[PDB]
Amino acid sequence: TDTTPPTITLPQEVIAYRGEEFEFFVETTDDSGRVNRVIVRNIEGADNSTYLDPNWIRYSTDNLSVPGNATPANPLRTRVYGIVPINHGVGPGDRYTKYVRAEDAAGNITALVDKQSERFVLVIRPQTEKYTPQVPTLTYVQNANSLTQTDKDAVIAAVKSANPNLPATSTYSVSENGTVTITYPDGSTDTIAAAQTVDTDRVAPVFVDEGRDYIFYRGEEGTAELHFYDNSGKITNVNFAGDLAASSTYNTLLGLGFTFNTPNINNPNNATEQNPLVTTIRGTIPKSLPAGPGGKYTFKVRATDASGLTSEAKIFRIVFANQTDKYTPNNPGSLTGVLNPQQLSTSEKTAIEEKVRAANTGNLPNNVQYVVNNDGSVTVIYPDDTPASRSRDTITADRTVQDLRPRNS
């Protein structure tokens, strides 16, 4: 006859967080392979007792009283589960020792012995003891002792972003100096100290292209890309009219129809070292302005961050240049024969221009004017050429002309 009770395997300690659900499994086997009952109960009561408290601890066995439910390979599984009430205590006495018994098909039941037989300890802990908040990226403010409401909202957002595994219903408050209090649904809390959340914004925005000269070719549309970042990574305004003198040159550039575009000026995180704020200046220096010593505009630009720290006016220049500096003419594919190198005919000059034009398509601007001189050399005149600023190239006669006179005897 089967005279042996079943074997019960279960965790000795189960940590349950106040307000959340818990669940774990009891595994029961017997030598006979069959178990008829699994029970969870308080230690007190008679041998036949099934009384268990509190009401929220629950349990269930899905396959009781069947052959093969309880062997080494197909153990009987009992689910113990429930939801800890939201107002439960979390003091050292907020724990529960409950006893587990099993009975086989021949009636052998496991022994029940206070503090000695099969049992688990259910310990109730606050939700804060389950989570460890990640420190956020620093938020830079005007005054670390007295944050504004947009500073507080900026800290909360950066704490939320670094902690996406905190409970959905967690509430957050930021103190006057930035100290973050995370409050969990059970009322337990957590604090991020001001040192890890905020700092007084002390450094103004950096103009990366300080002292740069951007070459604009007269008569050709060009662009200049200006770069700024900030330690906060946020820039709220770029100013080109800081003082009367900067306001005048800048106003002069707008008169020529230049535009100034900063597409990400109203966005957050728009100005970091890696991904800097970009101002693009776009326009054409007309040919009426000549290149040379005074062919330039000196600008002073200032940028401000969200803490209102404005930088000291910094400098860049637009520098005018002639189209000749940018282009280099191709030589024609063959020379043109001339009866007299001293003085080319009209037809001779015409064939030369045809070949020089044909060799430069895709290289020089389509509206370049070629002047074939009397000696067969070629003046290339670019569209921006003016008396006050010449923009021309020369192709020498030895690249365009071939003597066709016969040789002596």
Ligand X SMILES: CC(=O)N[C@@H]1[C@@H](O)[C@H](O[C@@H]2O[C@H](CO)[C@H](O)[C@H](O[C@]3(C(=O)O)C[C@H](O)[C@@H](NC(C)=O)[C@H]([C@H](O)[C@H](O)CO)O3)[C@H]2O)[C@@H](CO)O[C@H]1O
Rounded Cα–Cα distance for residues 35 and 74 (Å): 12
Given candidates 9, 65, 132, 298, which one binds ligand X under the rule CB under 6 A? 298
Rounded Cα–Cα distance for residues 112 and 101 (Å): 7
- Shortest reach from residue 298's CB to ligand X, in Å: 3
128 binds, options ligand X, Ca ion, none, Cβ within 5 to 8 A by partner type: Ca ion
Site string for ligand X, 158-187 (x = CB under 6 A): ------------------------------
**Short-list 25, 38, 10, 12, CA closest to 121:** 12
Site string for Ca ion, 383-402 (x = CB under 5 A): ----------x---------
Rounded Cα–Cα distance for residues 184 and 279 (Å): 44
Select the span of 124-132, 170-178, 285-293, 369-377 touching Ca ion (CB under 5 A): 124-132
Comparing CB distances to ligand X, the nearer of 276 and 295 is: 295
**362 sits near ligand X (criterion: CB under 6 A):** no
Rounded Cα–Cα distance for residues 409 and 387 (Å): 50
**Short-list 379, 375, 372, CA closest to 342:** 375
**353 sits near Ca ion (criterion: CB under 5 A):** no
**288 sits near ligand X (criterion: CB under 6 A):** no
What letters, b where the CB count within 10 A reaches 16 and e where it falls short, cover 315-325?
ebebebbbbbe
Rounded Cα–Cα distance for residues 144 and 195 (Å): 10
Displacement of CA 402 from its chain's centroid (Å)? 65
Residues 227-286 that bind ligand X (CB under 6 A): 245-246, 248-249, 252
Comparing CB distances to ligand X, the nearer of 196 and 249 is: 249
Q: Name the residue number minimizing CB distance to ligand X.
A: 249
Given candidates 20, 31, 220, 353, which one binds Ca ion under the rule CB under 5 A? 31
- Shortest reach from residue 340's CB to Ca ion, in Å: 29
- Shortest reach from residue 128's CB to ligand X, in Å: 19
Residues 101-160 that bind ligand X (CB under 6 A): 114-115
Cβ-based neighbour number of residue 128 at 10 Å: 20
CA-CA distances (angstroms) from residue 157 to 102, 194, 401? 53, 15, 75
Rounded Cα–Cα distance for residues 269 and 261 (Å): 18
- Shortest reach from residue 53's CB to Ca ion, in Å: 30
Comparing CB distances to ligand X, the nearer of 235 and 289 is: 289
Comparing CB distances to Ca ion, the nearer of 31 and 220 is: 31
Comparing CB distances to Ca ion, the nearer of 2 and 213 is: 2
> Position of tokens 């400098």?
315
Rounded Cα–Cα distance for residues 296 and 305 (Å): 29
**186 sits near Ca ion (criterion: CB under 5 A):** no
Sign, CA torsion 231/191/131/11: positive
Q: Contacts with ligand X: how many residues (CB under 6 A)?
A: 22
Comparing CB distances to ligand X, the nearer of 42 and 143 is: 42
- Residues near Ca ion (CB under 5 A): 2, 4, 30-32, 104, 128, 131, 190, 201, 230-232, 305, 324, 393
